[PDB]
Structure formats: structure tokens, C-alpha cells
Amino acid sequence: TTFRFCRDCNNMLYPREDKENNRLLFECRTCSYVEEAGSPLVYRHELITNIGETAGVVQDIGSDPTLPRSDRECPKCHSRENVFFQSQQRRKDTSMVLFFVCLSCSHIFTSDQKNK
């Protein structure tokens, strides 16, 4: 959704209808700061969410000794070694697809097949 804040009092900005130009316009509710809307989208609701499955990836994720290792191909380095883990989205209906981080380049690649 990419929310934005007022630059005058650091308060939330809300959508507003315009009559002269018939355009969406973001306005402050306390100090009356006004600016244009970058995108017409004003609300997003994810019934099926795909993000958050790879959350928690850090440049030192390989330093974790609990994470299991693998020799599967890295399709940016062609290196063997990498770490792997299942989806981090803890919904009970998530798939068991595995994600891999190359310890050299830090490229995240999945074991999915339909996506590829």
C-alpha cells in the first residue's frame, strides 16, 4: 500500500477527493498538509499472502549452526554449499516448499517446480 506520513507534524495522511481536477489527493488531518498521490491504490488486503515466507534472512544467516546445509545448485554461483529452511509463514495450510540461501552470494532460491 506504501503509506506516507506528513512532513510537517509527522502524522498520517489520508486520501481525499478533488473536484477541480478530479484526482486523488493526500491530505493531513490536523495541519492541512496536501500533496499528490503517487498511485491510485489506497487499500490492499491479502487473503492469500505470499510474503513473510522468506522473512528473517540476514547476511549472517549462514552463521546459524541449527540450520541444515545442502549441496544443491545455486543459480547465480553454481556453488554447492548453502543453507535451507521451510516457509516461515506459520499458517497451517502453507506448502512444504524449501528455500535456500547461498553462503557466498546470499541469493535466495526455492525448490518449487510450478513457479519454474
Binding site: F3, F5, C9, N10, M12, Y43, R44, H45
Partner: peptide, 30 residues
């Protein structure tokens, strides 16, 4: 400021889901 409160609560700008879930609270305390 609402922005400072949201920064205290949510540490990622890209995590818009948490911001959406958090909007009702600031609307309540407006």
C-alpha cells in the same frame, strides 16, 4: 506524532500489513 508511535511499534517501512492492522488504533486515538 503518529509516525513516531508507529516507528516505536513497527520497525519496517515495507511491512505495510502491520501498518494496515495498526491504522484502527491511531484512528481511535485521533
Amino acid at each position: 506524532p503518529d509516525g513516531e508511535i508507529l516507528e516505536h511499534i513497527c520497525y519496517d517501512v515495507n511491512d505495510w500489513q502491520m501498518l494496515e492492522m495498526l491504522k484502527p488504533c491511531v484512528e481511535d486515538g485521533f
